[PDB]
């Protein structure tokens, strides 16, 4: 500290007195993130784990809003054969809130999963399920042989093959009108060049892997300027006390020490402010208790020493800090032999103005030599 005092005054010699060199502060340990129990989960499991599945031509549409897209539990399960995402990474959308989400479920053949693509053209894409060029969602499919098959086969599925014109993107229409070719019109009968739009669709246990039925659920996420209704799973870290650490309480960032408090908040109140409109009390989102927010150390470093003549040792005074927190106030990085002696060890005295290191407390009273504060003075005499 003598060298620091010398070079703060731009002189190799110093006089008797106290000089302020620098300041100290306490680093946050890692971080703090807190959140309540849970927000309401989206009914994605109901669509995925559904006993009955609608046909591809009559795919059911469900509105998903006012919940959380907790798809991370199933993403890592790897229980779905296809999890391809178009226009966005599967994990990137997790940390984002989407205003409108829709769920579409249908059962198609294994080889027909490729037809569910943005802008895809085919007998199924252009007649049963059409996807627009703007497809921000992902296509999810998995095997359904254990549920959509039985002895003797199944014949409860239907699909559309013939229509007057190509289906518009995300357009569904059901009608019993028989498609009639322009060259050979039928005028309302089942004659030549006239086939019913609906045809029998079924599966049997003897079908191959590409012919087995597959349960396909289409989840799409898009953004609106309206307040968001769907978001991603929230993460919550452990809560620590009596330690200076960064905190993030429901988006409120800050640095300080979170300790227990005796003040009681109102049932609806969340934050707390003082006369100087600074946050100093934030409730725990998990459980109902109030934690105060306090600064870690602040303060400054002051060096107390006599003149360079007839004396060489120095004493260091830290302002507005407790003697227990001194070793972690900007340390563990300096040159050890001549800095740990002035930071820890003996000759530790706690004063009103702060913690004093390197000076031995004496019960005797003498005339003031070096001003410190609260009637405490330091002298080089024995």
């Amino acid at each position, epitope marked *: 500290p003598l060298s620091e005092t010398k070079c703060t005054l731009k002189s190799f010699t110093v006089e008797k007195g106290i000089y302020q060199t620098s300041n100290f502060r306490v680093q946050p340990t890692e971080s703090i993130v807190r959140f309540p129990n849970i927000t309401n989960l989206c009914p994605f499991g109901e669509v995925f784990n559904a006993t009955r599945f609608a046909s591809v031509y009559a795919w059911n549409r469900k509105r998903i809003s006012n919940c959380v897209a907790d798809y991370s539990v199933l993403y890592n399960s790897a229980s779905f054969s296809t999890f391809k995402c*178009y*226009g*966005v990474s599967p994990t990137k959308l997790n940390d*984002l809130c989407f*205003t*409108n*989400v*829709y769920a579409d479920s249908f059962v198609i053949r294994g080889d027909e999963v490729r037809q569910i*693509a*943005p*802008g895809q053209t085919g007998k199924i894409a252009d007649y049963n399920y059409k996807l*627009p*060029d*703007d*497809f*921000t*969602g992902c296509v999810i499919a998995w095997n359904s042989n254990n549920l959509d098959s039985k002895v003797g086969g199944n014949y409860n599925y239907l699909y559309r093959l013939f229509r007057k014109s190509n289906l518009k*993107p*995300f357009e569904r229409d059901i009608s019993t009108e028989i498609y009639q070719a322009g060259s050979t019109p039928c005028n309302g009968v089942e004659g030549f060049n006239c086939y019913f739009p609906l045809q029998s669709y079924g599966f049997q246990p003897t079908n191959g892997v590409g012919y087995q039925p597959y349960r396909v659920v289409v989840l*799409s*996420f*898009e*953004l*609106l*300027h*309206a307040p968001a209704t769907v978001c991603g799973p929230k993460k919550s870290t452990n809560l620590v006390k009596n330690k200076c650490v960064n905190f993030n309480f429901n988006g409120l960032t800050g640095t300080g020490v979170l300790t227990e408090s005796n003040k009681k908040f109102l049932p609806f109140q969340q934050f707390g402010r003082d006369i100087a409109d600074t946050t100093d009390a934030v409730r725990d989102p998990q459980t109902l208790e109030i934690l105060d927010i306090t600064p870690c150390s602040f303060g400054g470093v002051s060096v107390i020493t006599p003149g360079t003549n007839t004396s060489n040792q120095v004493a260091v005074l830290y302002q507005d800090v407790n003697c227990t927190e001194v070793p972690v106030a900007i340390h563990a990085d300096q040159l050890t032999p001549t800095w740990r002696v002035y930071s820890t060890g003996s000759n530790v005295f706690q004063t009103r103005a702060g913690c004093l290191i390197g000076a031995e407390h004496v019960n005797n009273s003498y005339e003031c030599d070096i001003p410190i504060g609260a009637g405490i003075c330091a002298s080089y005499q024995t």
Partner: nanobody
Amino acid sequence: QVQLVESGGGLVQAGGSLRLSCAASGRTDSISDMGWFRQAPGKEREFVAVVGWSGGGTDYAHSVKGRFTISRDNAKNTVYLQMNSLKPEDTAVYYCAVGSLRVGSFSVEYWGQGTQVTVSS
């Protein structure tokens, strides 16, 4: 009423690059996303690209994925759309459209006048 003003465009050859700018004026405080549309002579309009308010979450059409680039300047209320690896099939009149991304169809509350872009072989 939101007003859209377009600028840029022109004639470009195969493998060239082009830039498009669409500006929004009026009650733009409730506007977050703007998209571009194309239609060929005798063909319906189709989605091209879109940029979010924060600059992320952009989605491109399958035929144009990995080739286009879009950027939004909130300070100037103008969105710059960059074209790379252009192909003669990209010859159409480009329309910038202000709307909200909705599942099923990108609804547009107001459509801009637009400008033409020609790509030769």
